[PDB]
Amino acid sequence: MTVPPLLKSCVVKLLLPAALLAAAIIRPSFLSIGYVLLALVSAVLPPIRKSLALPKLVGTFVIITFLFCLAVALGVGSYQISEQVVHKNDRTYICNRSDTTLFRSIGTGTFESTRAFLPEIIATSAALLTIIIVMFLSHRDEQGREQRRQRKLAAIMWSAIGNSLRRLTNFVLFLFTAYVGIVKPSLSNSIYFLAFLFISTWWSTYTPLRHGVYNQIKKFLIFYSALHFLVLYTYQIPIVHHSWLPTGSFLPRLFGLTVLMDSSCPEWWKFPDLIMKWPLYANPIVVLVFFYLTVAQYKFTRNGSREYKESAASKGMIAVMTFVIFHSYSIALTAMMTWALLYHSIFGLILLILTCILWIFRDTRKSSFAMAPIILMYIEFLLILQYFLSMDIHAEIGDPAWMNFVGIEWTTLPVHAVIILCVQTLLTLPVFLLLRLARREKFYES
Amino acid sequence: KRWNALLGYTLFTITMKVCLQIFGCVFLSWFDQSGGWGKTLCIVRQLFS
Amino acid sequence: PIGRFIHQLFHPKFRYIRDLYPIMFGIDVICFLIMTFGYSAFGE
Amino acid sequence: IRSAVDLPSLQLVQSANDVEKMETAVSVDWQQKSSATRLLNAVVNCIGAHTDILCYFFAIMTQVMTGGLITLPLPLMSLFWGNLSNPRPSKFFWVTMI
Incomplete structure (x- = not known):
């Protein structure tokens, strides 16, 4: 009356958020x-192997989760x-005053006892299932040449598996x-974007980051x-939080x-109104998604690999690459050019008049690699003023007469903000590539 | 183990095969109104009674 | 999977010398008549 | 000593492991009137020797029975890998099929 351990680990992981987060x-x-x-604290559980027993801390807060579920069940009951x-009495449920405030600070009307019993039934059944499966059914039951070469070919397949999939x-x-x-430019993602831009300007320097600090x-x-x-x-709880943090204030915005x-x-x-139904009802669930996924990729990056002529075809591929390098000196300029036109900014006015002219220069590829970083600085401040023009604090911050004259205003459509930012990152990647090329040239020289 | 496995389970699941159907046949209704009780009393009655 | 083709095509080693073509011809004959005698199904 | 007598007896019985041969040999001698009791035994022994062909046949049957693409990888992978790899698909393909 026992079961294998891999299924135990997979099932506990699967039913962990299934009956708790739902x-x-x-x-x-x-x-x-x-x-x-x-759900989160158990979602950071280590795995269980066939040759490895269940960790003690894992079982410790599995016991604590069962205890919390049973205490919640007891109190609610x-x-x-x-x-x-x-x-x-009182089949009429009329609700008002401070009594509802406390009973909605939580901790007949038909659907009262009904909705009381369903979370309890699900939680008790799942917690008892997990605890009893741990308790009774132990996870560990016990305390030619061509064929081998073909089997080792699968090892060659797995050699590229670790080489490329994690990469x-x-x-x-x-x-x-x-x-x-x-998707949703606000205070929650400002540090995400600023850190991404700084690690991008680090990705310019071409020196790989030390293998201890990106962790x-x-x-x-x-x-x-x-x-x-x-x-x-x-923020999405009943009455007490709403009373404390009223709708329509700048702090939630x-x-x-x-x-x-x-x-x-x-x-x-x-x-x-489906437009804005995409941000508001995408962002909560999908930030749950990123939260869980980034914990998973932290684990994956934690793991890895155990190791840590006269050819004319030669001619073609190599020569094409040198031409591509010449092309790299120009490609990013095309990009900024289109982008400036796409925006419509005295700032676009400047990219145009400023970029059209460094155009007649007789000495060329060298000059561009040299002057790329400050260009990265100019285009970098732009995405920031753009996130500004994005926040749903459109009118509260204020639009002075100078900002009326410049013509650069906010974005009343967050769907349009999603669009322009998605275009912005994908089309400003080439200036990051140019910075990488300049840094590699400087590294090569010295 | 086999006794509890393939002998206990078969009788243990055949014993309700009559009283669950008598439950379904009993006093007409115990499942069908507006809001939120018997859609989850259905998810179980989609395969139990 | 270069080793797969290399093994199946170049190094089988114990070539088994057999010649099963008449069986293939019989199968193909059986299929032509089923395409013919049965024609109403293939047409709407 | 009973084991040391029976084990060589069953080892000599299994020394008649010429199944890979008989699959043709009995295929001759059952073509004529050979209705003795050995015919059924030889047929039973032969049907258990080409079991991989039976697995492929039943994969084709279970694909044609439903006619969807969920089961389609079963015969597609079965043919492409097993019928083109070797006499023995290396005992890992079978795990994938399982």
């Missing part, structure tokens, strides 16, 4: 935030008891964090993303906090 979405309250804290008993998925992570700030950078990113998501969780009903003081109702 229960959190089912009944948003001060109880569900603790549920999601349990006893409250159900007292409430169903004492009144025994490419790292690239997808950089574009992953790039997309997050594009720290990404750890800070993970911690802030998780805490931000937790802050947005505490800066921090990236959104409304989900009339609210007022409390007006009461329920608690549930």
Whole structure:
């Protein structure tokens, strides 16, 4: 009466957020935030192997999660008891005054006892399932040449597996964090974008980052993303938080906090234009997505590999690459040119008049590599003023007469902001490439 | 182990095969109204009773 | 998977000398008549 | 001593491991009137020797029974890998199929 350990680890990991985080979405309250804290702390569990026993700390806070689930069940049940008993009346549920404030600070009407029992049933069944599976069914039951060569060919396949998949998925992570700030520009993603630009100007220097410190950078990113998501969780709770942080203030606007009903003081109702439905109802779930995914890629990057003529075809490929280098001296200029035209800024006016003229220069590739960084500086301040023109504090900050004269105004459409930022990053990558080329040339020279 | 595995489970799952159907046949309705109880009493009644 | 083709095509070593073509011809004959005798199904 | 007598007996019985041969040899001697009890035994022994062909045949059957693309990788991969790799698909392809 025992089961294998790999299935045990996979099943515990799978049912960990299944009955905890979905229960959190089912009944948003001060109880569900603790549920999601349990979900995260158990989501950073180490794996379980066939030859390795279950870790003691893993079981320790599995016991703590069962204890918390049982305590929540006991408290909710006893409250159900007292409430169903004492009144025994009032099929009309009329709600107002401070009584609703406390009972919605949480911790007959048909759907009251109903919605009380479903989270409890699910949580108790899942917690008992996990605990009993741990308790009874132990994970560990016990305490020619051509064929071998073909088997080793699979090892050659896995040699490229570690060589390339981890390498490419790292690239997808950089574009992953790039997309997050594009979607919803606010205080939550400003540090993401500024850190990305600084690590980009580091990616210019061509010297690989020391293999101990990007762990720290990404750890800070993970911690802030998780805490931000937790802050947005505490902002989508019942009445007490709403009363404390009223809808329509500048503080929610800066921090990236959104409304989900009339609210007022409390007006009461329920608690549930596609353009803007994309940011507001993308960002919460998808920042959960990035939070979990970046923890996963921290783990992956933690792992890795154990090791840590007269050819004319030659002619062609090599010569083409040299031509491509000449082309690299010009390509980025095309890009900024189009971008300036695309915007429509006295700033565009300047890119145009400033760039069109460094055009007649007789000495060429060398000059451009030399003057690229300050150009990186100019185009770098632009994305920042753009995130500014993005925040939903359009009118509260103010638009002086000078800003009226310049013509560069805010973006009343966050979908348009998503569009222009997505274009901005993809089309400003070439100046990063030019900076990389200049840094490599400087490194080569010395 | 085999006794509890392929002998206990078969009888243990065949014993309700009659009382679950009598449950389904009993006092007409215990499942069908507006809001939120028996859509999850359905997810179980999609395969139990 | 260069080793796969190298093994299957170049180094089988124990060439088994057999010649099964008449069986293939019989299979193909069986299929032509089923395409013919049965023609209403292939047409709408 | 009973084991030291029986094990060589079963080892001599399994020394008649000429199955890879008989698959042709009995294929001759059952073509004529040979209705003795050895015919069924030889047929049973032969049907258990080409089991991989049976696996491919049943893969084709289970693909044609449903006719979707979820099961399509089963026969596609089965043919492309097993029928072109070797007499033995190296015992790892079987794990993937399982």
